[PDB]
Amino acid sequence: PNFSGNWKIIRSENFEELLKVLGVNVMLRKIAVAAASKYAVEIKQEGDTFYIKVSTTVYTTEINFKVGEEFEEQTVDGRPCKSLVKWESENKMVCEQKLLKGEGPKTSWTKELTNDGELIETMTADDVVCTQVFVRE
Numbered sequence: 624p625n626f627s628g629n630w631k632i633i634r635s636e637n638f639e640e641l642l643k644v645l646g647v648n649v650m651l652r653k654i655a656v657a658a659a660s661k662y663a664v665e666i667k668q669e670g671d672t673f674y675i676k677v678s679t680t681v682y683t684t685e686i687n688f689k690v691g692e693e694f695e696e697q698t699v700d701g702r703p704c705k706s707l708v709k710w711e712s713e714n715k716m717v718c719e720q721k722l723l724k725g726e727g728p729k730t731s732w733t734k735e736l737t738n739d740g741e742l743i744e745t746m747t748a749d750d751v752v753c754t755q756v757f758v759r760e
């Protein structure tokens with residue numbers, strides 16, 4: 624596969640329900656759903672090394688990892704975590720997270736390249752799954 628590209632969001636489902644699981648109050652959940660409508664992902668893949676830049680209108684973050692080696696990022700609601708990415712198949716990776724301090728719901732994410740040229744990202748908290756679909760810019 625090659626995940627590299629500038630990806631633009633075309634669909635986003637269940638994001639508000641994910642944030643509710645994470646304890647975000649109602650008004651901020653709605654504002655965040657609106658922000659996710661400008662969600663853009665820039666990926667550069669070199670083998671199993673990934674450089675990913677995730678951004679909205681006012682915020683941008685970089686996530687750099689190599690498949691199979693632990694790294695530190697943050698969960699969706701912003702708590703620091705230790706993460707480990709593995710392949711599930713040729714075109715799908717899955718990341719398990721574990722909080723660096725304290726307790727909280729079990730979180731994870733996936734990225735998948737479909738045969739139709741889409742990028743599907745999922746984010747999970749407990750048993751609520753958010754699905755976001757992107758196309759190349």
Ligand SMILES: *C/C=C(C)/C=C/C=C(C)/C=C/C1=C(C)CCCC1(C)C
Pocket residue numbers: 655658659662675677678679686698699700732733734744
């Ligand atoms: C492989 C993809 C990864 C690691 C993406 C992570 C994305 C996020 C933590 C996104 C968070 C967002 C918010 C909390 C509010 C604004 C909209 C998002 C989706 C960018």
